[PDB]
Design a protein around this ligand. Structure first.
Ligand code: HC4
Length: 125
């Protein structure tokens, strides 16, 4: 396992050194996005929540294609305001119900170390 705690204060620094393989070792769901909503990375722990197959979503748009539930001021509204402001760091509970059993999660969104990339972290509550 990759020993990194969900919500860590320097998680962006840590996850910068990892590759596709290493991100599969985390105890929580991790998704990388560009500033538009396209998925750049998707770890196996996230797949173990949504029934989604990582390889088949990478390149698709999160808010438009993959996960319509997040297309809301409560989720997508925060992302866009962060992508706009040049900073994002927020944690909240959400429910995923698209093509899946309604599942309650804790979500964490934080700007990455790179310029136009954002992290979405998911865990069960
Ligand atoms: C509503 O958000 C639907 C779905 C969904 C699919 C994949 C991931 O990673 C989160 C949420």
């Amino acid at each position: 396992m990759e020993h990194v705690a969900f919500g860590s204060e320097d998680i962006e620094n840590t996850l910068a050194k990892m590759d596709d393989g290493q991100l599969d070792g985390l105890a929580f769901g991790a998704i990388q996005l560009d500033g538009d909503g396209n998925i750049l990375q998707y770890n196996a722990a996230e797949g173990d929540i949504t029934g989604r197959d990582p390889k088949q979503v990478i390149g698709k748009n999160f808010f438009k294609d993959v996960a319509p539930c997040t297309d809301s001021p409560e989720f997508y509204g925060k992302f866009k305001e962060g992508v706009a402001s040049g900073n994002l760091n927020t944690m909240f509970e959400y429910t995923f119900d698209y093509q899946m059993t309604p599942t309650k999660v804790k979500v964490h969104m934080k700007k990455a170390l790179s310029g136009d990339s954002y992290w979405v972290f998911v865990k069960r509550v």
